[PDB]
Amino acid sequence: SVYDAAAQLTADVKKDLRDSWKVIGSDKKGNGVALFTTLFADNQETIGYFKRLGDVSQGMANDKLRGHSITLMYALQNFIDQLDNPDDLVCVVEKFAVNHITRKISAAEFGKINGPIKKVLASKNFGDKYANAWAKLVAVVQAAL
Amino acid sequence: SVYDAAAQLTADVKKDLRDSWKVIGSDKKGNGVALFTTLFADNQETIGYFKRLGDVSQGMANDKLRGHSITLMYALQNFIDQLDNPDDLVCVVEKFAVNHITRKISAAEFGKINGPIKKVLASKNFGDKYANAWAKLVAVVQAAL
Ligand code: HEM
Numbered sequence: 392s393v394y395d396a397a398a399q400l401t402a403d404v405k406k407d408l409r410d411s412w413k414v415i416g417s418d419k420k421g422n423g424v425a426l427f428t429t430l431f432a433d434n435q436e437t438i439g440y441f442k443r444l445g446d447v448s449q450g451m452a453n454d455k456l457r458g459h460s461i462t463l464m465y466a467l468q469n470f471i472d473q474l475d476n477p478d479d480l481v482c483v484v485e486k487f488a489v490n491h492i493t494r495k496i497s498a499a500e501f502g503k504i505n506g507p508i509k510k511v512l513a514s515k516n517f518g519d520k521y522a523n524a525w526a527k528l529v530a531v532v533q534a535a536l
Numbered sequence: 537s538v539y540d541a542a543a544q545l546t547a548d549v550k551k552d553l554r555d556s557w558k559v560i561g562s563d564k565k566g567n568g569v570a571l572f573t574t575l576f577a578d579n580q581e582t583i584g585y586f587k588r589l590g591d592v593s594q595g596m597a598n599d600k601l602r603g604h605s606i607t608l609m610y611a612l613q614n615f616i617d618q619l620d621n622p623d624d625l626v627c628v629v630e631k632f633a634v635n636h637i638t639r640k641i642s643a644a645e646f647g648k649i650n651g652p653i654k655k656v657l658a659s660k661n662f663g664d665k666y667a668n669a670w671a672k673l674v675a676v677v678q679a680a681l
């Protein structure tokens with residue numbers, strides 16, 4: 392279950408998540424757009440899912456894309472803040488899960504975000520250990536899809 | 537015009553929003569649920585819009601309501617963080633506006649949140665001065681509906 396997936400996040404993982412978020416989370420507009428734009432360049436098949444955002448190739452200049460990207464980073468902020476309380480983490484994860492379930496996004500497709508996260512982390516010198524920690528957090532969401 | 541409304545956020549208004557947010561934003565779960573239990577208590581006619589959350593009268597015990605409430609507080613956090621840049625505040629406001637336009641929520645009904653905000657602020661010893669500052673922030677979203 393989602394609860395089991397959340398309850399598994401260890402102290403070392405939470406530590407790595409929080410330490411890395413201190414940095415990548417400090418510039419939500421910049422890192423959010425980079426994270427999201429990287430998803431398109433590496434997984435072109437997903438572009439169609441974001442038609443509401445207009446021409447996503449416009450990057451930062453696209454106000455809809457910018458608003459979406461900044462807001463996505465606050466979803467992650469939400470997750471990071473609820474780490475010490477699985478019950479709260481679970482209810483916010485399920486809330487965001489519905490938003491994707493309605494868009495027909497499968498657990499496998501949601502996992503496509505791992506590549507982008509790993510790359511953004513690397514641009515800030517956070518290695519594989521940190522990428523693995525984030526994959527574990529993403530896995531919590533996947534348990535809900 | 538969302539741009540004209542954003543212009544209404546002067547130095548003094550932004551300061552009050554920040555000062556008050558430091559207090560109410562420190563407990564997103566508690567204050568977030570307080571907002572909704574108040575909204576549904578004072579304006580029962582709005583309950584229908586929230587069918588997905590189930591029995592809202594359950595308050596904190598309702599996982600869907602709690603997840604919803606926490607998430608809402610992060611939208612306000614988003615707004616507060618974008619006060620320095622009107623162009624970024626506008627794009628995040630329009631993003632959330634769409635979420636309500638799709639649910640057929642009008643500017644007038646969105647404004648019903650002012651009552652709960654004033655009550656929650658009052659409970660923390662923040663008077664009309666602060667309630668009015670927040671009413672101006674809500675006005676920015678109303679301009680986009
Ligand atoms: C770190 C992981 C992710 C987070 C935290 C996240 C967060 C969000 C948030 C907050 C929204 C706005 C929900 C709404 O207002 O309706 C959203 C929308 C959406 N997401 Fe994600 N998402 C993630 C990954 C993905 C991935 C991997 C895909 C694609 C395979 C995806 C597809 C979508 C779609 C199609 C929408 C609707 C966009 C629109 O039309 O506004 N998301 N996401």
Ligand code: HEM
Pocket residue numbers: 490582585586587588589604607608611612632635636639641645646647648649674
């Ligand atoms: C401070 C003002 C408010 C903010 C910042 C706000 C924020 C949000 C956010 C972030 C969501 C989740 C979006 C999504 O995932 O689709 C949401 C959903 C919603 N909001 Fe608001 N909202 C506010 C006031 C209101 C008011 C006053 C009403 C009704 C009169 C309203 C009606 C809705 C409805 C119907 C939903 C969908 C709930 C669901 O089925 O999950 N909102 N709002």
